[PDB]
Scaffold this active site. Structure first.
Site, PDB file in Angstrom:
ATOM      1  N   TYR A   1      -2.652   4.472  -2.269  1.00  0.00           N
ATOM      2  CA  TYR A   1      -3.264   3.173  -2.015  1.00  0.00           C
ATOM      3  C   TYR A   1      -3.494   2.826  -0.550  1.00  0.00           C
ATOM      4  O   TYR A   1      -4.187   1.851  -0.248  1.00  0.00           O
ATOM      5  CB  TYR A   1      -2.458   2.060  -2.680  1.00  0.00           C
ATOM      6  CG  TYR A   1      -2.609   2.036  -4.182  1.00  0.00           C
ATOM      7  CD1 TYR A   1      -1.749   2.764  -5.005  1.00  0.00           C
ATOM      8  CD2 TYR A   1      -3.632   1.304  -4.781  1.00  0.00           C
ATOM      9  CE1 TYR A   1      -1.906   2.760  -6.392  1.00  0.00           C
ATOM     10  CE2 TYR A   1      -3.799   1.293  -6.163  1.00  0.00           C
ATOM     11  CZ  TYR A   1      -2.934   2.022  -6.960  1.00  0.00           C
ATOM     12  OH  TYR A   1      -3.099   2.011  -8.325  1.00  0.00           O
TER      13      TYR A   1
ATOM     14  N   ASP B   1      -6.227  -2.888  -3.374  1.00  0.00           N
ATOM     15  CA  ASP B   1      -7.460  -2.226  -3.792  1.00  0.00           C
ATOM     16  C   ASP B   1      -8.555  -3.241  -4.115  1.00  0.00           C
ATOM     17  O   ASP B   1      -9.125  -3.252  -5.206  1.00  0.00           O
ATOM     18  CB  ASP B   1      -7.195  -1.282  -4.977  1.00  0.00           C
ATOM     19  CG  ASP B   1      -6.414  -1.939  -6.104  1.00  0.00           C
ATOM     20  OD1 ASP B   1      -5.731  -2.956  -5.865  1.00  0.00           O
ATOM     21  OD2 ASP B   1      -6.472  -1.416  -7.236  1.00  0.00           O
TER      22      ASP B   1
ATOM     23  N   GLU C   1       2.816  -9.100 -13.787  1.00  0.00           N
ATOM     24  CA  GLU C   1       1.849 -10.095 -14.225  1.00  0.00           C
ATOM     25  C   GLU C   1       2.343 -10.876 -15.440  1.00  0.00           C
ATOM     26  O   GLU C   1       2.036 -12.057 -15.591  1.00  0.00           O
ATOM     27  CB  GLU C   1       0.517  -9.415 -14.537  1.00  0.00           C
ATOM     28  CG  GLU C   1      -0.543 -10.331 -15.113  1.00  0.00           C
ATOM     29  CD  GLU C   1      -1.893  -9.653 -15.189  1.00  0.00           C
ATOM     30  OE1 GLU C   1      -2.619  -9.670 -14.175  1.00  0.00           O
ATOM     31  OE2 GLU C   1      -2.216  -9.085 -16.256  1.00  0.00           O
TER      32      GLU C   1
ATOM     33  N   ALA D   1       0.855  -1.175   0.000  1.00  0.00           N
ATOM     34  CA  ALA D   1       0.000   0.000   0.000  1.00  0.00           C
ATOM     35  C   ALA D   1       0.895   1.231   0.000  1.00  0.00           C
ATOM     36  O   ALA D   1       1.344   1.692   1.049  1.00  0.00           O
ATOM     37  CB  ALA D   1      -0.899  -0.011   1.228  1.00  0.00           C
TER      38      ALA D   1
ATOM     39  N   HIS E   1      -7.418 -15.127 -14.297  1.00  0.00           N
ATOM     40  CA  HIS E   1      -7.796 -13.726 -14.450  1.00  0.00           C
ATOM     41  C   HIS E   1      -9.254 -13.664 -14.906  1.00  0.00           C
ATOM     42  O   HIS E   1      -9.643 -14.352 -15.848  1.00  0.00           O
ATOM     43  CB  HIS E   1      -6.861 -13.053 -15.460  1.00  0.00           C
ATOM     44  CG  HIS E   1      -7.108 -11.587 -15.643  1.00  0.00           C
ATOM     45  ND1 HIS E   1      -6.114 -10.641 -15.504  1.00  0.00           N
ATOM     46  CD2 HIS E   1      -8.221 -10.909 -16.008  1.00  0.00           C
ATOM     47  CE1 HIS E   1      -6.605  -9.447 -15.779  1.00  0.00           C
ATOM     48  NE2 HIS E   1      -7.881  -9.582 -16.088  1.00  0.00           N
TER      49      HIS E   1
HETATM   50  C1  LIG Z   1     -11.189  -8.535 -22.833  1.00  0.00           C
HETATM   51  C2  LIG Z   1     -11.785  -7.988 -21.548  1.00  0.00           C
HETATM   52  C3  LIG Z   1     -10.978  -7.918 -20.369  1.00  0.00           C
HETATM   53  C4  LIG Z   1     -11.342  -6.881 -19.182  1.00  0.00           C
HETATM   54  C5  LIG Z   1     -10.294  -6.836 -17.991  1.00  0.00           C
HETATM   55  C6  LIG Z   1      -8.976  -6.094 -18.290  1.00  0.00           C
HETATM   56  O1  LIG Z   1      -8.317  -6.258 -16.999  1.00  0.00           O
HETATM   57  C7  LIG Z   1      -6.955  -5.830 -17.029  1.00  0.00           C
HETATM   58  O2  LIG Z   1      -6.180  -6.856 -17.674  1.00  0.00           O
HETATM   59  C8  LIG Z   1      -4.787  -6.509 -17.786  1.00  0.00           C
HETATM   60  C9  LIG Z   1      -4.117  -7.607 -18.590  1.00  0.00           C
HETATM   61  O3  LIG Z   1      -4.695  -7.712 -19.884  1.00  0.00           O
HETATM   62  C10 LIG Z   1      -4.186  -6.338 -16.393  1.00  0.00           C
HETATM   63  O4  LIG Z   1      -4.285  -7.564 -15.683  1.00  0.00           O
HETATM   64  C11 LIG Z   1      -4.955  -5.244 -15.644  1.00  0.00           C
HETATM   65  O5  LIG Z   1      -4.455  -5.117 -14.324  1.00  0.00           O
HETATM   66  C12 LIG Z   1      -6.442  -5.598 -15.603  1.00  0.00           C
HETATM   67  O6  LIG Z   1      -7.184  -4.531 -14.977  1.00  0.00           O
HETATM   68  C13 LIG Z   1      -7.413  -4.657 -13.609  1.00  0.00           C
HETATM   69  O7  LIG Z   1      -8.282  -5.783 -13.383  1.00  0.00           O
HETATM   70  C14 LIG Z   1      -9.578  -5.642 -14.015  1.00  0.00           C
HETATM   71  C15 LIG Z   1     -10.358  -6.907 -13.722  1.00  0.00           C
HETATM   72  C16 LIG Z   1     -10.297  -4.390 -13.493  1.00  0.00           C
HETATM   73  O8  LIG Z   1     -10.591  -4.546 -12.114  1.00  0.00           O
HETATM   74  C17 LIG Z   1      -9.423  -3.152 -13.697  1.00  0.00           C
HETATM   75  O9  LIG Z   1     -10.051  -2.022 -13.109  1.00  0.00           O
HETATM   76  C18 LIG Z   1      -8.051  -3.375 -13.057  1.00  0.00           C
HETATM   77  O10 LIG Z   1      -7.207  -2.265 -13.324  1.00  0.00           O
HETATM   78  O1  UDP Z   2       0.907   1.853 -11.889  1.00  0.00           O
HETATM   79  C1  UDP Z   2       0.786   1.199 -10.852  1.00  0.00           C
HETATM   80  C2  UDP Z   2      -0.355   0.428 -10.449  1.00  0.00           C
HETATM   81  C3  UDP Z   2      -0.276  -0.300  -9.121  1.00  0.00           C
HETATM   82  N1  UDP Z   2       0.869  -0.232  -8.299  1.00  0.00           N
HETATM   83  C4  UDP Z   2       0.925  -0.961  -6.992  1.00  0.00           C
HETATM   84  O2  UDP Z   2       0.098  -2.135  -7.072  1.00  0.00           O
HETATM   85  C5  UDP Z   2      -0.745  -2.262  -5.893  1.00  0.00           C
HETATM   86  C6  UDP Z   2      -2.106  -2.861  -6.294  1.00  0.00           C
HETATM   87  O3  UDP Z   2      -2.240  -2.841  -7.711  1.00  0.00           O
HETATM   88  P1  UDP Z   2      -3.410  -2.437  -8.699  1.00  0.00           P
HETATM   89  O4  UDP Z   2      -3.844  -1.054  -8.355  1.00  0.00           O
HETATM   90  O5  UDP Z   2      -2.895  -2.651 -10.098  1.00  0.00           O
HETATM   91  O6  UDP Z   2      -4.479  -3.514  -8.191  1.00  0.00           O
HETATM   92  P2  UDP Z   2      -5.777  -4.179  -8.863  1.00  0.00           P
HETATM   93  O7  UDP Z   2      -6.843  -3.203  -9.216  1.00  0.00           O
HETATM   94  O8  UDP Z   2      -5.176  -5.018  -9.925  1.00  0.00           O
HETATM   95  O9  UDP Z   2      -6.442  -5.054  -7.676  1.00  0.00           O
HETATM   96  C7  UDP Z   2      -0.879  -0.854  -5.347  1.00  0.00           C
HETATM   97  O10 UDP Z   2      -0.950  -0.884  -3.918  1.00  0.00           O
HETATM   98  C8  UDP Z   2       0.443  -0.162  -5.752  1.00  0.00           C
HETATM   99  O11 UDP Z   2       1.411  -0.185  -4.720  1.00  0.00           O
HETATM  100  C9  UDP Z   2       1.974   0.528  -8.710  1.00  0.00           C
HETATM  101  O12 UDP Z   2       3.002   0.620  -8.025  1.00  0.00           O
HETATM  102  N2  UDP Z   2       1.874   1.190  -9.940  1.00  0.00           N
END
Ligand SMILES: CCCCCCO[C@@H]1O[C@H](CO)[C@H](O)[C@H](O)[C@H]1O[C@@H]1O[C@@H](C)[C@@H](O)[C@@H](O)[C@@H]1O
Ligand code: UDP
Ligand code: HG
Ligand code: HG
Ligand code: HG
Ligand code: HG
EC number: 2.4.1.40
Length: 263
Positions: free
Chosen positions: A64, A131, A221, A60, A151
């Site tokens: 965050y 988050d 990832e 965090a 995912h």
């Molecule tokens: C084809 C439709 C897919 C919709 C989800 C996209 O999610 C994002 O996927 C990328 C990789 O392709 C990353 O994993 C990224 O972190 C994902 O977004 C995060 O997760 C999704 C589920 C949503 O909660 C977003 O707000 C997040 O930022």
């Molecule tokens: O550009 C970014 C996006 C996320 N984070 C880190 O990733 C953690 C959680 O990630 P994200 O916000 O991508 O979580 P999600 O929505 O995937 O649950 C946060 O606490 C941050 O410390 C970061 O350093 N840079």
């Protein structure tokens, strides 16, 4: 080691699949955890008899830290309830960490931003994004040497559509004809040993990409997926464990929504 006590529960039907709508086991015989596939009573007994301790790590930083309160409060109601839990919050704002009331046998450490410390205090490590919030049961059914989570946006996707790193110049590279699943970087874990091996491998791979002036399309990832492609997880968690209801709704295939993004 120790024997389970007498327990009374439904037999289990050799000729009746627990699920007819989803895949419940991978090609390498690792279970895919969906509601209905496990008896939590049996599993709780097995892990309690081992006095298992689960570590939950979260980062965090900056803005965050605002997600910590809801994160920890909901974890207290749904994460490993009944077992020993040790929360590890890595933050750049130690004083901003909310004082959350914890149940017995649970503790929290604030680490401002060691490796051997984990090996000494917990048996398993669960690494997730902050988050999010727990909305239903997330327990010992997930524990295993190494696990990845499907995912939510690609569980029904073909491998060619997976957002793997597609550049041969990156250590996270995965060609179009390779790949089992697209795992979420926001929820993974396993034994301390296996988790350290994964993070260690990914750290070195990212260092290599850096020197070569390249950065994987989805960073951590992307490397997680390369690692799990080459080192098959011993358990795969279904999307029940990593969801976003605002973006994806609540499909019939998900009998429960356990860990989700905060709108
Ligand atoms: C084809 C439709 C897919 C919709 C989800 C996209 O999610 C994002 O996927 C990328 C990789 O392709 C990353 O994993 C990224 O972190 C994902 O977004 C995060 O997760 C999704 C589920 C949503 O909660 C977003 O707000 C997040 O930022
Ligand atoms: O550009 C970014 C996006 C996320 N984070 C880190 O990733 C953690 C959680 O990630 P994200 O916000 O991508 O979580 P999600 O929505 O995937 O649950 C946060 O606490 C941050 O410390 C970061 O350093 N840079
Ligand atoms: Hg971790
Ligand atoms: Hg890796
Ligand atoms: Hg890394
Ligand atoms: Hg990784």
């Amino acid at each position: 080691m120790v024997s389970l006590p007498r327990m009374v529960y439904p037999q289990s039907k050799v000729l009746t699949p627990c699920r007819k709508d989803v895949l419940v086991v991978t090609p390498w015989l690792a279970p895919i955890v969906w509601e209905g596939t496990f008896n939590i009573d049996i599993l709780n007994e097995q892990f309690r008899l081992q006095n298992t301790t689960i570590g939950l790590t979260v980062f965090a930083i900056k803005k965050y830290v605002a997600f910590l309160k809801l994160f920890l409060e909901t974890a207290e109601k749904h994460f490993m309830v009944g077992h020993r839990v040790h929360y590890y919050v890595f933050t750049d704002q130690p004083a901003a960490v909310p004082r959350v009331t914890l149940g017995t046998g649970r503790q929290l450490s604030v680490l401002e931003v060691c490796e051997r410390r984990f090996l000494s205090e917990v048996d398993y490590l669960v690494c997730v994004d902050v988050d999010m919030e727990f909305r239903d049961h997330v327990g010992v059914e997930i524990l295993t040497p190494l696990f990845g989570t499907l995912h939510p946006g690609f569980y029904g996707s073909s491998r060619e559509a997976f957002t793997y790193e597609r550049r041969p110049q990156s250590q996270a590279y995965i060609p179009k004809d390779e790949g089992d699943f697209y795992y979420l970087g926001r929820f993974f874990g396993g034994s301390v040993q296996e988790v350290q091996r994964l993070t260690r491998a990914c750290h070195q791979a990212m260092m290599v990409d850096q020197a070569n002036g390249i950065e994987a399309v989805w960073h951590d990832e992307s490397h997680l997926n390369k690692y799990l492609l080459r080192h098959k997880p011993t358990k795969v968690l279904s999307p029940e464990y990593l969801w976003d209801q605002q973006l994806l709704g609540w499909p019939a295939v998900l009998r429960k929504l356990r860990f989700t993004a905060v709108p």
